[PDB]
Scaffold this active site. Sequence first.
Site, mmCIF file in Angstrom:
data_model
loop_
_atom_site.group_PDB
_atom_site.id
_atom_site.type_symbol
_atom_site.label_atom_id
_atom_site.label_comp_id
_atom_site.label_asym_id
_atom_site.label_seq_id
_atom_site.Cartn_x
_atom_site.Cartn_y
_atom_site.Cartn_z
ATOM 1 N N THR A 3 -9.792 8.008 23.097
ATOM 2 C CA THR A 3 -8.381 7.710 22.954
ATOM 3 C C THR A 3 -7.666 7.508 24.292
ATOM 4 O O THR A 3 -6.452 7.288 24.338
ATOM 5 C CB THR A 3 -7.693 8.813 22.154
ATOM 6 O OG1 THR A 3 -7.856 10.067 22.824
ATOM 7 C CG2 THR A 3 -8.292 8.930 20.763
ATOM 8 N N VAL A 11 -2.760 4.344 28.941
ATOM 9 C CA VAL A 11 -4.112 4.484 29.456
ATOM 10 C C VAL A 11 -5.126 4.591 28.326
ATOM 11 O O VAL A 11 -5.133 5.563 27.570
ATOM 12 C CB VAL A 11 -4.241 5.702 30.379
ATOM 13 C CG1 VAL A 11 -5.583 5.677 31.103
ATOM 14 C CG2 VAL A 11 -3.100 5.721 31.377
ATOM 15 N N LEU A 68 -5.722 8.382 27.473
ATOM 16 C CA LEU A 68 -4.712 9.424 27.599
ATOM 17 C C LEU A 68 -3.758 9.379 26.408
ATOM 18 O O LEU A 68 -2.574 9.081 26.555
ATOM 19 C CB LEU A 68 -3.951 9.297 28.922
ATOM 20 C CG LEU A 68 -4.794 9.514 30.182
ATOM 21 C CD1 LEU A 68 -3.917 9.469 31.420
ATOM 22 C CD2 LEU A 68 -5.549 10.831 30.103
ATOM 23 N N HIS A 69 -4.303 9.672 25.231
ATOM 24 C CA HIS A 69 -3.550 9.691 23.991
ATOM 25 C C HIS A 69 -4.045 10.824 23.108
ATOM 26 O O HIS A 69 -5.162 11.337 23.291
ATOM 27 C CB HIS A 69 -3.688 8.350 23.257
ATOM 28 C CG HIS A 69 -3.134 7.186 24.017
ATOM 29 N ND1 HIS A 69 -3.905 6.409 24.870
ATOM 30 C CD2 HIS A 69 -1.886 6.662 24.065
ATOM 31 C CE1 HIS A 69 -3.142 5.463 25.398
ATOM 32 N NE2 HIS A 69 -1.930 5.589 24.935
ATOM 33 N N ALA A 70 -3.215 11.211 22.143
ATOM 34 C CA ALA A 70 -3.577 12.289 21.214
ATOM 35 C C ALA A 70 -3.809 13.603 21.951
ATOM 36 O O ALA A 70 -3.165 13.839 22.981
ATOM 37 C CB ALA A 70 -4.811 11.914 20.374
#
Length: 86
Positions: A12, A55, A14-16
Site C-alpha cells: 500500500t 507514495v 505509505l497508505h493504510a
Amino acid sequence: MKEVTIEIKNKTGLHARPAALFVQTASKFSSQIWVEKDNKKVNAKSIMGIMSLGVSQGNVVKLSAEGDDEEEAIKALVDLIESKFG
C-alpha cells in the site's frame, strides 16, 4: 541533519496501517522529520502531509531528520520500511 534515499516496497506504500505506523514511529522522536517524493517535501509526523505525497509501492522517497535524535530517527524509519512494516 541526516538524510536517506529509500524505496518504499510494501503493497500500500505509505497508505493504510503502514501509513499510521510510519507517522507514529516518527512521532516517537523529538527531531523534525521530513519525507520528499518528486519535488514535494512534507512533515513525516503529519498524516495529511504523507497522504498528499501519494507514495505508492516502488516509489523512491528521501527521508531526512534534524534534531537531537536525528540519527536514531532515520534508523528507526529505515528499519521499519525495510521490514516492509512487518
